């Protein structure tokens, strides 16, 4: 309804810079999409679970930026993930997995992802340039028009 993409990522500098510099610039300016990024768009205080759930429910898509740090137990990234799985199952929210860094051991959450969920593989610096295979695959997974 209100956002096109909720971007969920691991709260570390490298992956935050991935979202804030590389992902946002392309998603916002080359595709035209309106994003929700919790640390950018949230209000302080209040119930954290309620704020994330509300934001996810108000978004046409949700990107999971998957990396070893994303899946650490008690992380807010896992909170976003689990609430995303919830919204997938309750209101058919479409999730998208951007594979930023491969996981170092299989994670049980991945199997909660419905069949139709797109997996897009980030291959480092070579994926960054416009028209890369990464960007083409992700654009197909996103709404038809902005």
Curated annotation (Swiss-Prot):
Organ and tissue specificity: Detected in liver, skin, placenta, thymus and lung. Isoform 4 is predominantly expressed in brain. Overexpressed on candidate chronic myeloid leukemia (CML) stem cells, hematopoietic stem cells and mononuclear cells of patients with acute myeloid leukemia (AML). Overexpressed in patients with chronic obstructive pulmonary disease (COPD). Expressed in T-helper 1 (Th1) and T-helper 2 (Th2) cell subsets.
Induction entry: Isoform 1 is down-regulated by phorbol ester treatment. Isoform 2 is induced by phorbol ester treatment.
Entry superkingdom: Eukaryota
Function: Coreceptor for IL1RL2 in the IL-36 signaling system. Coreceptor with IL1R1 in the IL-1 signaling system. Associates with IL1R1 bound to IL1B to form the high affinity interleukin-1 receptor complex which mediates interleukin-1-dependent activation of NF-kappa-B and other pathways. Signaling involves the recruitment of adapter molecules such as TOLLIP, MYD88, and IRAK1 or IRAK2 via the respective TIR domains of the receptor/coreceptor subunits. Recruits TOLLIP to the signaling complex.
Subunit structure and binding partners: The interleukin-36 receptor complex is a heterodimer of IL1RL2 and IL1RAP; the association is inhibited by IL36RN. The interleukin-1 receptor complex is a heterodimer of IL1R1 and IL1RAP. Associates with IL1R2 to form a non-signaling interleukin-1 receptor complex. Isoform 4 interacts with IL1R1 in an interleukin-1-dependent manner. Interacts with IL-33-bound IL1RL1 to form the minimal interleukin-33 signaling complex with a 1:1:1 stoichiometry. Interacts with KIT (independently of stimulation with KITLG/SCF).
Family: Belongs to the interleukin-1 receptor family.
Entry comment, domain topic: The TIR domain mediates NAD(+) hydrolase (NADase) activity. Self-association of TIR domains is required for NADase activity.
The protein, known as: Interleukin-1 receptor accessory protein
Gene source species: Homo sapiens (Human)
Primary gene name: IL1RAP
Parent-protein start and end of this portion: 403 to 540 of 570
